[PDB]
Amino acid sequence: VFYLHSRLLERCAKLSDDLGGGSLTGLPIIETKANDISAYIPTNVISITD
Amino acid sequence: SRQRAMKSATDNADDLIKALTLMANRERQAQITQEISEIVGGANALA
Amino acid sequence: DTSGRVVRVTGPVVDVEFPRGSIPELFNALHAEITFESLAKTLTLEVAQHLGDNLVRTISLQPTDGLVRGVEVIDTGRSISVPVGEGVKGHVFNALGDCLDEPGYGEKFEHWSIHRKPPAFEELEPRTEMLETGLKVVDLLTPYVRGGKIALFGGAGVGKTVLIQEMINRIARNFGGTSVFAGVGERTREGNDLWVELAEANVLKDTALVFGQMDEPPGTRMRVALSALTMAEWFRDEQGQDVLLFIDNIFRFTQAGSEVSTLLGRMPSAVGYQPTLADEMGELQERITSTRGRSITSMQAVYVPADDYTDPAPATTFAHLDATTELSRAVFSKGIFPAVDPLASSSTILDPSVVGDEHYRVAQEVIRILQRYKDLQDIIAILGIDELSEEDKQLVNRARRIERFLSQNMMAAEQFTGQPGSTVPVKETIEAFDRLCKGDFDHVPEQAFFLIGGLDDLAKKAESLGAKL
Amino acid sequence: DTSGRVVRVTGPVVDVEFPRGSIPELFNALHAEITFESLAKTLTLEVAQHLGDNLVRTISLQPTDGLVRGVEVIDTGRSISVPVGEGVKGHVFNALGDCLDEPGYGEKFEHWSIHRKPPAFEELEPRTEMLETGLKVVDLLTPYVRGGKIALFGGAGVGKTVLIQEMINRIARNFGGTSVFAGVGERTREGNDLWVELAEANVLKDTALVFGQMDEPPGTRMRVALSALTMAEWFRDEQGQDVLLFIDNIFRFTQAGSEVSTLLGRMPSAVGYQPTLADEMGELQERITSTRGRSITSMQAVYVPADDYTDPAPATTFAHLDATTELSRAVFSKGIFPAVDPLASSSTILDPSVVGDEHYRVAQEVIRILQRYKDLQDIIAILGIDELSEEDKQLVNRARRIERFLSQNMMAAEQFTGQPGSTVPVKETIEAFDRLCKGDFDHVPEQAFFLIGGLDDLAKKAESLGAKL
Amino acid sequence: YTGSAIAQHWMYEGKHVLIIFDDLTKQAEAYRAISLLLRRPPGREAYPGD
C-alpha cells in the first residue's frame, strides 16, 4: 500500500526547463477516524507528501 | 470550604483514575487480540 | 543451455527455473527482458531463496510490469556490483551503479559487490572524540562522535531532512575527506534539491550521491543503502581517509524488506514486520562503522512510524548507535526548532571523562530542570501556575527559558522563516546554559530566547523587546 | 439432464455441481428439497461464486438443517424476484416476496429482480431542500433533506428505533406518497408492533413492509434490503410520486454479509468484516437515491458495534448520507432524548445558501458553545465549575441550558412516559436558541428546559418551578 | 437451545413458559471455543462473526 500511494504521488513533479518546465501539483485527501492521524494509511501518506 | 472542596476533588480524581484504568486495560487487551489476529491471519494465508 | 525461465510473477517477486547444475547462488544478479515498447527494459533480479526442484525466488529491482512467464533469464554469475574509486565523487548514481548525472560514466571503473561481511571484531575500537556542530542542543545534550554512529529519530515531518541537510552544511562543507549520501526511499524533490545545493556550494565534487527513492520497487529500496555503503567502504578500506556517510531514512531499507516478506513465504512477525528484522538490520548496520585507524562518521535519519518509539524498527535501530537525536512532534507543535526532545535523546560521550566536568554538569542540570517541568506541566494545566511552590515557579520559568534557548535558527531553515542561521561554539553554549540554570536571565521574557544564537543575539533580541541582560 | 447436485453443505452455504454447459449465472436462484418431514421445505439457493470444475458456491435463504448431499438442484434461470406495483401497499412480505399477511397474495403481480444497477450518473442530481420534522435538535443542527439520505447512528439501546418511529409518525402520516419499510435483522416483536401501529394509524394502506429479522440465515438478512429497495425503486421509476424508505439497521445487512463471507471461505479484512465491505455497501446504497424529478427520501438506522464509531461498518456507511444523526450514550445517560450528539452529527444543507443566515448563525453559535463546554469537561469533572473564568462559567451555564433544551418530548415517547409529544416550528427553534445563546434565560433553572417544546412550554415549566422568563 | 426447545413445545400447546439462561456469556465463550477449534477467523474480542 505504501508503494501504491508513493508511486502514485511521486509522479507529481516540477519538470526541468529542458523537459518543458511543466508541473503537476498534488492534493491527496486522507480521512482519519477519531482524529487518529497515526493510523496505517495516514502515516504512509504523510511521509510521502511535501 | 477549601478542605471540603479538596476532599471532593480527591474523590473525583480517584474515580477518574479508576475509569481511565478500566479503559486502558480494555485497550491493552484489544491491542493484544488485534495483533494476534493479524499474525495468525498472515500465518494462515501462508499455510 | 545454462539459461533460466520465468515461472511465476507476483508483483516484485519472480520465480525462475534453471536446469540442474545451473542454479544461481544466493544474491546473484540475473537479467530478464521486457520487450513491450512502452516498458521495454532489462530487469535485474536478485536471487533471494532456493525454492527446490531447481526453482529460485528472486526480487526485481525494476517494476515487472510487462514481464511474460517463460522468457529467458541470464545468470551473470555475481552479485550486484557498483563502481568504486575516486571517480564516483561528484556524480549521482543509481542503486545498480548507473550514473544519472552522466549516463555511461563509471562503466569501466573497478566494481565492488554490494554484499559484504562486517569488519572482524579484532578490528573494532570505540570512538570517543566529540564532533562539534554549532547547534546548542546537539553540542550540549547529544554531542556527536568523530568516526562514530549518529542517528536522527523522528516521526513523519518533524525535522529529519532539514536537520541532516543542516549537518551536511555544518560538518561536510569544511571537511577534508570524502562524503557519501544515500537517499534511501525518500522524495525525489528533496534529492534534486540536495544535488543542486551541493553543486552550488562547490561541495558536490567531494560527494558521491546514490539515490533510490519512494517510487522504486522494494528491491531498489533494499539495495541502494548497500550500494552507497560499498562506495563508502571502498573510500574507508582502500583510499583510507575520513569518510562521511549520510543515509536518509535507513528505515525505508527495513520497510522494503517487509514489503516482500510474505511474498517470499515468511510468516509475519509481531507488528507486521519480517521475522528477520533485527538480523538484516544488523548485517547492514555493522558494516557502517570505523575500524582501527579508518574513520567513517555516519549520520542516519530514522523514521519513527506513527510517532511510536516502541515500534520494532526504531526500537532495534536504537542499539546500533553512538549518538541519537530524537525529534518529537510535541516539541514540533510548540514551534521549537530543531524539534529535539532533550529528555529522550542521548549520547555515549556525554561523560565527564570526555566532555569535561562543566559540560556534563550543565547538561545534567538542564535535563533535571526540563524533567521537573515535564512533571509539573499537568498540575499547571489543571490547577494553574499559582498552586506551585516559589521554588517550583522559579524552576518553571527557568525551564521555559531553557527549552526556548535550546531552539536555534538553522542554516538550512532560512527557506522556512526567512531568517539566516547561526553557529554557536560549545563553550559559549555551556556558559550560556550555566547562566540560565543559575537564573541570570530570569528577568528576560520567554521570547528573545526563541530561535536565536548565542548571548549576543540574546542581548539584541531582549533589548528589541525592552530588556537588558 | 441439466439439474445440479449438492456436493458440500457448510452451514447456510451450499456447493452445487452442474453438468458441463449448464452452469447457472451469478445471483440465479436454485431450488433444493429438504424432505425430512419435520423440516421439509424448499431451499432457495442464490449463486454467489463459480468455483471451477463445474462447481458453484451458493448462499441459502433458508436454514439448511436436513439437507443431504447429492440431492437434485433445479436452476430457475433467473434471480430472486419480488412483486411490484400498487398491490404491495398494505401488506407484509418475505425477502423472497411471499406475503405473510395473506399467503399467496401478489403471485400474479409483475415481478422485478432484486438485483438492479444503480441509476446512471447523468440522471443524478443533488437535493438541497429542507425536510422540516418538528424536532428542535434535528431542525436546527442536522436539517433533513427532501429526497436525500438520512441515517441514525447509535449503539445498543440509545433510541434508534424510537427515532425511526418518531420520523414515521412525523413524516409518513401527513405524507402524500408511498412508504416502504425494511426490517433488516431486527426484532420480530418490533415488526408486529409496527404492523399493528400502522394499521391503527390508517397508514398501512400506504406502506409496504418487508421483514427479514434476527432469526433468519444470513442470506435472508443480506437480501431483504434488496427486496424492499426493489419495491421502492418500482414506486420511484414507474409511478414517480415521493417514495419514503425506512431501513432499520442496515448494519445487520453488513453483518450478515460478513457472516456469509466467512462461510464462503474469503480472507477477512480488519476487525473481521468481509473484504468486499465497502463494495457491497456501495452497491446497495447507490440504488437508494433520488433521480431527476423522482424523489426517494431515505431513513436508515445504523447500529454502532460496542459503541465504536471507528468500526469499519458505520465508518463506511458515513460517506453515503446527506444527513447523519449520531446518538451518544453519554447524552443518553443524562436522560436527554433524543440522545443526539450535536458535535458529531451533521447535514449537507446546514449552509447559509440553503437554510438562511440566521438559521446558520444560531446553529454555529450553539455548536461553538457546546464545543467550548466539551473542552472543559476534565476541569469540571475534577474541580467543578467553580475554578473557571467568569467567561467560562457563563458559557458553561448557557451550555447546560442549551443541551437540556435540545431534548424534546417525542410523540413516540408517550409509550414510555405517558407524556404527549410536541412539535416546534423551525422559526421558533431559531428564535429560542438565539435567545438562549444571547443569555435571555440565564436565570431560569437547568430543569424547565428538559423535555419540552417551544418557548411557551419553557415559560410554563419555568413558572411551575418558580422562575419567570 | 435444548432448554428453549423444551420450553417451545409447551408454548405451542397454549401454555405459558418462563426460561432462564444462567449465562449467555458462557455460551458465547463456548461457541467461540468451538469456532476457533474449527479454524474460523475471529472478529471483535476473538468472537465469531455469528
Ligand SMILES: Nc1ncnc2c1ncn2[C@@H]1O[C@H](COP(=O)(O)OP(=O)(O)O)[C@@H](O)[C@H]1O
Ligand atoms: N529548524 C527548523 N526551522 C524552521 N522550520 C523547520 C525546521 N525544521 C523543520 N521545519 C519545518 O518542518 C518541516 C519538517 O520537514 P522535515 O523535517 O524535512 O521532514 P522529515 O522529518 O519527514 O524528513 C519542514 O518542511 C520545515 O518547513
Ligand SMILES: Nc1ncnc2c1ncn2[C@@H]1O[C@H](COP(=O)(O)OP(=O)(O)O)[C@@H](O)[C@H]1O
Ligand atoms: N425519546 C425517548 N424518550 C424516552 N425513552 C426513550 C426514548 N428513546 C428511546 N428511549 C428508551 O430507550 C430505548 C431505545 O430502544 P431502541 O430505539 O430500540 O434502541 P436502539 O438505539 O438500540 O435502536 C427505548 O425502548 C426506551 O426504553
Ligand SMILES: [Mg+2]
Ligand atoms: Mg525526511
Ligand SMILES: [Mg+2]
Ligand atoms: Mg432497535
